[PDB]
Coordinates of C-alpha atoms and ligand atoms in Angstrom, one line a residue:
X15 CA -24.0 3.2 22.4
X16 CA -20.3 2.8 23.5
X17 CA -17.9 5.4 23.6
X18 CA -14.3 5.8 23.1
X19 CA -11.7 9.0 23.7
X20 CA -15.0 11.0 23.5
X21 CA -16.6 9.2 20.1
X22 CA -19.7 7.5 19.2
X23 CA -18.2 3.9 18.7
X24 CA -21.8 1.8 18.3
X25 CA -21.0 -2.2 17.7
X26 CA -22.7 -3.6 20.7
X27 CA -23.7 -6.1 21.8
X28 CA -21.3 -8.9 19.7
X29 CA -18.7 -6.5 20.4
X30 CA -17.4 -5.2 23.9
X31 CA -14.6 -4.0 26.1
X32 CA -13.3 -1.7 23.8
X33 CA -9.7 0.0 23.8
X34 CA -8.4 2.9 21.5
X35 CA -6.0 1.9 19.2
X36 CA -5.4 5.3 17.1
X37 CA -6.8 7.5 14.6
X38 CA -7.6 8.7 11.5
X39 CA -8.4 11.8 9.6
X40 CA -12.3 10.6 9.8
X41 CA -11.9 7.5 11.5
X42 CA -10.7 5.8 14.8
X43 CA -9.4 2.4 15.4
X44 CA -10.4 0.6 18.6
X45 CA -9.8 -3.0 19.7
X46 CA -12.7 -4.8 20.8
X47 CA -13.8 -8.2 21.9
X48 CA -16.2 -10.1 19.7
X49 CA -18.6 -12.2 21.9
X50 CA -19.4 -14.8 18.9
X51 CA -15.6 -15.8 17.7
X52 CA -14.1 -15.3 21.5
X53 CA -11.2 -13.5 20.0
X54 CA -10.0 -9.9 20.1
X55 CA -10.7 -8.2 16.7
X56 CA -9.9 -4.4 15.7
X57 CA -12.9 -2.3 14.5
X58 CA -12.3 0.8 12.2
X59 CA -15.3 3.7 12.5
X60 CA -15.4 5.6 9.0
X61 CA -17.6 8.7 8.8
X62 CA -17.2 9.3 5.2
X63 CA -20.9 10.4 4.2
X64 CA -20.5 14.2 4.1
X65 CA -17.7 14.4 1.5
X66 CA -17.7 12.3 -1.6
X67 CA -13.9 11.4 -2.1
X68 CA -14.4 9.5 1.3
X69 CA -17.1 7.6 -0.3
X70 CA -15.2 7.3 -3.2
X71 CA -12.5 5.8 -0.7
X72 CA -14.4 3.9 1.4
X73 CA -16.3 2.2 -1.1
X74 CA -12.9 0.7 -3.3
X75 CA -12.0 -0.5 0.2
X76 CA -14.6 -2.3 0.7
X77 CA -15.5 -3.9 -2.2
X78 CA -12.2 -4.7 -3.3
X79 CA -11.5 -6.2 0.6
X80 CA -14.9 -8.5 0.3
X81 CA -13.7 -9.8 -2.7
X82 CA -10.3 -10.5 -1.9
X83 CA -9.5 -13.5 -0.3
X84 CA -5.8 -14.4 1.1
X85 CA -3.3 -14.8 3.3
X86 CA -1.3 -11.4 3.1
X87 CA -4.3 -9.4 2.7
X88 CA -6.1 -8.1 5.4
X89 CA -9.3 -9.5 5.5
X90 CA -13.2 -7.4 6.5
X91 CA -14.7 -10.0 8.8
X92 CA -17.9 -8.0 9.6
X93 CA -19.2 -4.4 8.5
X94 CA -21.6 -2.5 11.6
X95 CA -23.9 -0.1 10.5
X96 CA -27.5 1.2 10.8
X97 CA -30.4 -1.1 9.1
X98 CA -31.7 2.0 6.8
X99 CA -29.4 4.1 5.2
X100 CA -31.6 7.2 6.5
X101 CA -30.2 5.8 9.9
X102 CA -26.7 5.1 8.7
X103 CA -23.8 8.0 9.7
X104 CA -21.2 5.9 10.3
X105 CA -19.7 2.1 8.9
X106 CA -17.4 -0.2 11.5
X107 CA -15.1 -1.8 9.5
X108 CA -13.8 -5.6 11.8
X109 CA -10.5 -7.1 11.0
X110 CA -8.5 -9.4 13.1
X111 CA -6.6 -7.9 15.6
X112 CA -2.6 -7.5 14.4
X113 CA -0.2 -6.4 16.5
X114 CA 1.6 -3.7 14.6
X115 CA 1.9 -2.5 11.7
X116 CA 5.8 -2.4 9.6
X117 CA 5.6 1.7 10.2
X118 CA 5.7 1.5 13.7
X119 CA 7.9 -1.6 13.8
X120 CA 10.3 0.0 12.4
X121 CA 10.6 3.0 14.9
X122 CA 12.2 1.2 17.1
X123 CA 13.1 -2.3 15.7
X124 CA 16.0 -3.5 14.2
X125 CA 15.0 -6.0 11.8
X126 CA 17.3 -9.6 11.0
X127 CA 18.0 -10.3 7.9
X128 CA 15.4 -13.6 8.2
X129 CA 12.8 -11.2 9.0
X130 CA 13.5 -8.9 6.3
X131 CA 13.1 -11.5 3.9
X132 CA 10.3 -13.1 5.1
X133 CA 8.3 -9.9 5.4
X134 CA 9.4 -9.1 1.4
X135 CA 8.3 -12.6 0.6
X136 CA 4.6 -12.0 2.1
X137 CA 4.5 -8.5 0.8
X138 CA 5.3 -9.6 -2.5
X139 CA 2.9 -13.0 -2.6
X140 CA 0.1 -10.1 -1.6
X141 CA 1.1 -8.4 -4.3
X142 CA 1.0 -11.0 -7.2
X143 CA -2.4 -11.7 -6.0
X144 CA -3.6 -8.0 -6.0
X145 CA -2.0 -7.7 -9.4
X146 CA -3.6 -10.6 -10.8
X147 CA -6.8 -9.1 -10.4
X148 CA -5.8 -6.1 -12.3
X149 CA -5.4 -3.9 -9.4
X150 CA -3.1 -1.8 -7.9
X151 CA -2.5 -0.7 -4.7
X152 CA -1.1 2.7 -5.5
X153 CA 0.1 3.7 -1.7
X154 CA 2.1 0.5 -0.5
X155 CA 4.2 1.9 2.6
X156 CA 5.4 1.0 6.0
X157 CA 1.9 1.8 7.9
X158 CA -0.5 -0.2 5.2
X159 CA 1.3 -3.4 6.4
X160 CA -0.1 -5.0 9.2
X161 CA 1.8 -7.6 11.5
X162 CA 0.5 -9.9 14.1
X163 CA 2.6 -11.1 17.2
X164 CA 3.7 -14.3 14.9
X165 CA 5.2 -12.0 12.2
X166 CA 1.9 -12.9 10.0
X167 CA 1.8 -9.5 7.2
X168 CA -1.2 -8.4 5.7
X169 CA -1.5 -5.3 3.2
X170 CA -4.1 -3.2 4.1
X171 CA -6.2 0.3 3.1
X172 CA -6.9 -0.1 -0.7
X173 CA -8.9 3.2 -1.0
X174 CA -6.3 4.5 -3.5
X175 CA -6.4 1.7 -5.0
X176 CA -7.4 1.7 -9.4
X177 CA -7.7 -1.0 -11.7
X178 CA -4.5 -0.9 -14.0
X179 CA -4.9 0.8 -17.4
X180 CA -1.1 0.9 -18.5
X181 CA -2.5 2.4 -22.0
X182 CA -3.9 5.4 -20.7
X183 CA -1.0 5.9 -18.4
X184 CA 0.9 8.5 -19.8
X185 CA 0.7 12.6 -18.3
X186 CA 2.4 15.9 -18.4
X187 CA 5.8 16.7 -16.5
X188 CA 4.8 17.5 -12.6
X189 CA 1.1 17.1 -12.9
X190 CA 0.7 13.5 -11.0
X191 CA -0.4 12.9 -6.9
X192 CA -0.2 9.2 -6.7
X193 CA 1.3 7.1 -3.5
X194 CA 2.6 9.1 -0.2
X195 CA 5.6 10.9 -1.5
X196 CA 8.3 8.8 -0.2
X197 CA 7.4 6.0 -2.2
X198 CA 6.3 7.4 -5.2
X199 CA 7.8 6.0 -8.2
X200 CA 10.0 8.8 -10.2
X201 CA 7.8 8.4 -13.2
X202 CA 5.3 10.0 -11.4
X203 CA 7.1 13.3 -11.3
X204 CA 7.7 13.0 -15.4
X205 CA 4.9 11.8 -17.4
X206 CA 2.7 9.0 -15.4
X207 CA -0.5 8.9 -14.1
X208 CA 0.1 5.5 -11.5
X209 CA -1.8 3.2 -13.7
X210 CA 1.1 0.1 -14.3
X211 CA 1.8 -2.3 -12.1
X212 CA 5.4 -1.1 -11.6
X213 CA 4.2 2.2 -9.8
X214 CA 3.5 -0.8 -6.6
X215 CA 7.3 -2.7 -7.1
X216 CA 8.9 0.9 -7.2
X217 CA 6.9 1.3 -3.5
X218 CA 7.8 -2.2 -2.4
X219 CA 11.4 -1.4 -3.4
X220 CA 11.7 1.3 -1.2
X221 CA 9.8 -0.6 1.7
X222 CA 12.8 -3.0 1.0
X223 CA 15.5 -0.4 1.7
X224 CA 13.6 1.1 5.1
X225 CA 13.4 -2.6 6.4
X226 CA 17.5 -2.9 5.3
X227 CA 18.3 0.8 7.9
X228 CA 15.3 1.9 9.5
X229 CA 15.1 5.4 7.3
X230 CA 13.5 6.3 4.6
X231 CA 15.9 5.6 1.1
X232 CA 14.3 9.0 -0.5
X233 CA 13.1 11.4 2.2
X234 CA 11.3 14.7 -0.1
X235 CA 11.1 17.0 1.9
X236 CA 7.8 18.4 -0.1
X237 CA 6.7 17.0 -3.2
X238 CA 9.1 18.3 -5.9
X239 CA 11.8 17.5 -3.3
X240 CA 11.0 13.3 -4.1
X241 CA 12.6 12.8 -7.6
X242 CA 16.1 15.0 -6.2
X243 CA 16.6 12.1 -3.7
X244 CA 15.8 9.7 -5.9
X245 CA 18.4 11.1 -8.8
X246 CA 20.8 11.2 -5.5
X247 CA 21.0 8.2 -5.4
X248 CA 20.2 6.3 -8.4
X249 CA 21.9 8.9 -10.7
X250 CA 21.4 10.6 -14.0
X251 CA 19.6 8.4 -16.4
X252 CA 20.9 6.6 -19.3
X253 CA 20.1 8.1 -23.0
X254 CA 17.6 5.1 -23.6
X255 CA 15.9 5.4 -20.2
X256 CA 15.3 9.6 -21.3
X257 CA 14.5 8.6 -24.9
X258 CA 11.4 6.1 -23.6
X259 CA 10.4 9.5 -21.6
X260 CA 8.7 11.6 -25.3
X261 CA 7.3 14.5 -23.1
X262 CA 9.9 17.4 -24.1
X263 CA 8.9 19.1 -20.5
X264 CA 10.1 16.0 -18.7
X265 CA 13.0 14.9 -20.9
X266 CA 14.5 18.8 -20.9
X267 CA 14.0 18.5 -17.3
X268 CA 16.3 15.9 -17.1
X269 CA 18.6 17.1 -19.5
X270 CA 18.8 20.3 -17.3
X271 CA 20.6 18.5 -14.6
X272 CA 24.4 18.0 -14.1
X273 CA 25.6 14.4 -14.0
X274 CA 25.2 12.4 -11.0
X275 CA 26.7 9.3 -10.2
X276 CA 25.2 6.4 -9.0
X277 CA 25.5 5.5 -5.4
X278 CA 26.6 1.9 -4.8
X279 CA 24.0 -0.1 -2.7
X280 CA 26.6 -1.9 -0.6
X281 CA 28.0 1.6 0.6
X282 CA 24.2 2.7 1.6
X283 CA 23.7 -0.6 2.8
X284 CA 27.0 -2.1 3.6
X285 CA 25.4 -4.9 6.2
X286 CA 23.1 -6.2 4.2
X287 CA 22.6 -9.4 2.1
X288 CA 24.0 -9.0 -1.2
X289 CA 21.4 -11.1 -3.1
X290 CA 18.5 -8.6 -1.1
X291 CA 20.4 -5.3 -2.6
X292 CA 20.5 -7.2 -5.7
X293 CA 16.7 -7.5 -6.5
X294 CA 16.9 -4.2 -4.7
X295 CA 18.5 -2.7 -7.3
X296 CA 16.5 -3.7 -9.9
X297 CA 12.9 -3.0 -8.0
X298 CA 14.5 0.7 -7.8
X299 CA 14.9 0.6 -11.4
X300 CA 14.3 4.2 -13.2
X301 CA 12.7 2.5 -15.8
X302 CA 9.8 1.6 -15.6
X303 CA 9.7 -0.5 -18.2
X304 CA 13.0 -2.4 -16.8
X305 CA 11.3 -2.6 -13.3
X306 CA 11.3 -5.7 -12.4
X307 CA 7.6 -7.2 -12.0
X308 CA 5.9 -9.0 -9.2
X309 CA 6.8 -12.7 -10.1
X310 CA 9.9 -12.1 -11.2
X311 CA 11.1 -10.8 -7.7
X312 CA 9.4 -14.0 -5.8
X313 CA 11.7 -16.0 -8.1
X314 CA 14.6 -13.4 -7.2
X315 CA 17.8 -15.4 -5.1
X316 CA 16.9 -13.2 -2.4
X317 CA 13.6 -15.2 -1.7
X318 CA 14.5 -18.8 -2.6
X319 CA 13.9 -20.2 0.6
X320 CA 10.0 -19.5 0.5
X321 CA 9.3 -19.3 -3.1
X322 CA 6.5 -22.0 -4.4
X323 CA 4.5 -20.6 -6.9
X324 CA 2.2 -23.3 -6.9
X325 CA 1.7 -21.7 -2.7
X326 CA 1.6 -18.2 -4.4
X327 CA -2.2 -18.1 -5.5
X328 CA -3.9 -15.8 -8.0
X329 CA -7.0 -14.0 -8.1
X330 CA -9.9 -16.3 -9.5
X331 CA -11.9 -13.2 -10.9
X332 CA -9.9 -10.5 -11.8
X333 CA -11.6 -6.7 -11.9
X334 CA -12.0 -5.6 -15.6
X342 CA -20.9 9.8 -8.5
X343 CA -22.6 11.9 -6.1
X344 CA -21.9 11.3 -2.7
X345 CA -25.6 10.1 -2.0
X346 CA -24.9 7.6 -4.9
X347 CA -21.9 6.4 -3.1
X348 CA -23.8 6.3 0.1
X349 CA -26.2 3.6 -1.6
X350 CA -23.5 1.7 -3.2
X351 CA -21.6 1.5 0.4
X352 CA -25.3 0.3 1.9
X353 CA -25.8 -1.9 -0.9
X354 CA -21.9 -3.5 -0.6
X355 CA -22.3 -3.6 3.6
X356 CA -26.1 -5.7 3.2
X357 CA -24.6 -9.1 3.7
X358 CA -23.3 -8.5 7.1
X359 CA -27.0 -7.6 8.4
Ligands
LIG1 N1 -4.9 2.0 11.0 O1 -4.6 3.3 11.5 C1 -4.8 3.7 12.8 C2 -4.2 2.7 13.7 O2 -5.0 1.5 13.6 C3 -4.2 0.4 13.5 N2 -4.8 -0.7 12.8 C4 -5.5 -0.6 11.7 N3 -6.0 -1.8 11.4 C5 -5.6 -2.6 12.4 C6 -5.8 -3.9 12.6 N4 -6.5 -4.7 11.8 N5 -5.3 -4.4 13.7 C7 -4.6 -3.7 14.5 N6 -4.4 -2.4 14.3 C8 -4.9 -1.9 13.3 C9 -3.0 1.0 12.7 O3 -1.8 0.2 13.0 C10 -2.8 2.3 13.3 O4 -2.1 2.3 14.4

């Protein structure tokens, strides 16, 4: 087999001339051309057989990638792997080749204000689609949005990813590990368990304000941290958004801080558009309840130059272990590429 930066990467023969792309915590990302197509395509190796949350992981990716099907959604055009699953250590993930991803984009790029609504626009005509199959993404941020050299964004890496149970939602005060702590919802903190769609438009919200400066609206430093900056900026709550919040421990928690005013968006963000702080605002709602939801930000002002809901499809068949289990279930889900 191939090899790359001193690793096992075995896709031959369709795919050749490999180059390292970067890395993973059990899995590297290498370009690679694919004989058949005559394109570049990336290839992702995922070792995830000796522990069973990377099962767990790797199999929601999968199965909820092969199902999916659109335009700002990354697509799996072929799984590698062994022919037995006695033979089978590691799966090779192929997607098409993009450029960059909005993470590293925004390192060093200054983004126009026509970019940064056209990126919201995909990122939110993704998300109605992903929602209207009941799912959510639970760890939208910068890196898990993929760009190719035309500006083309895809959403990527749904192994957090839970089909949405907004009944069974509610938790204990400081209990809950959902997103990557920037862009985790405040609920989280207080008393929900990340299963309502608005736990994905708090994370697109603050995607929105990274693409508006380049930083990070609420940097935590470590996880309790998160909810300070957020109460920085968005203030104390309002009596009726603490009385929707029942659990004492959250509510007191609350209560126990000292008034804090809002700060104005336009002095955060006092170049941008004022219709995009406007549906900013009310993506970043506390509430969750008041968040706004996926369709009603494509209809938002800010986007009325690409909205067409007719061009904004929906999911045609919405979603309603031990790790040897989860092994067979990823062999079984990886059979029609063979
Ligand atoms: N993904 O995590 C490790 C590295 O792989 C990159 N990547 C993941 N999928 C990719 C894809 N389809 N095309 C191009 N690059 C990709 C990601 O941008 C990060 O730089």
């Amino acid at each position: 087999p191939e090899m790359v930066r001193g690793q096992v990467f075995d896709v031959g023969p369709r795919y050749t001339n490999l180059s390292y792309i970067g890395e993973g915590a059990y899995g590297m990302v290498c370009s690679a051309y694919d004989n058949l197509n005559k394109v570049r395509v990336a290839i992702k190796k995922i070792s995830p057989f000796e522990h069973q949350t990377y099962c767990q992981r790797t199999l929601r990716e999968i199965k909820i990638l092969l199902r999916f099907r659109h335009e700002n959604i990354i697509g799996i055009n072929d799984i590698i792997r062994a022919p037995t699953i006695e033979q089978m250590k590691d799966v090779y993930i192929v997607q098409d080749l993009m450029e960059t991803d909005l993470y590293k984009l925004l390192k060093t790029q200054h983004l126009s204000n026509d970019h940064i609504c056209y990126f919201l626009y995909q990122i939110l005509r993704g998300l109605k689609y992903i929602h209207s199959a009941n799912v959510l993404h639970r760890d939208l941020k910068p890196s898990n949005l993929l760009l190719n050299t035309t500006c083309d964004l895809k959403i990527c890496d749904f192994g957090l990813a839970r089909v949405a149970d907004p009944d069974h939602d509610h938790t204990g005060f400081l209990t809950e590990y959902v997103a990557t702590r920037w862009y985790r919802a405040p609920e989280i903190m207080l008393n929900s368990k990340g299963y309502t769609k608005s736990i994905d438009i708090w994370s697109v919200g603050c995607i929105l304000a990274e693409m508006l400066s380049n930083r990070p609206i609420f940097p935590g430093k470590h996880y309790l941290d998160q909810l300070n900056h957020i109460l920085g900026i968005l203030g104390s709550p309002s009596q009726e958004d603490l009385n929707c919040i029942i659990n004492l421990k959250a509510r007191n928690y609350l209560l126990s801080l000292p008034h804090k005013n809002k700060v104005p968006w336009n002095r955060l963000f006092p170049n941008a558009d004022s219709k995009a702080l406007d549906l900013l605002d009310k993506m970043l709602t506390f509430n969750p309840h008041k968040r706004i939801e996926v369709e009603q930000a494509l209809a938002h002002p800010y986007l009325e130059q690409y909205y067409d809901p007719s061009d904004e499809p929906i999911a045609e068949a919405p979603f309603k272990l031990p790790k040897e289990k989860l092994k067979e279930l990823i062999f079984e889900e990886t059979a029609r590429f063979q």
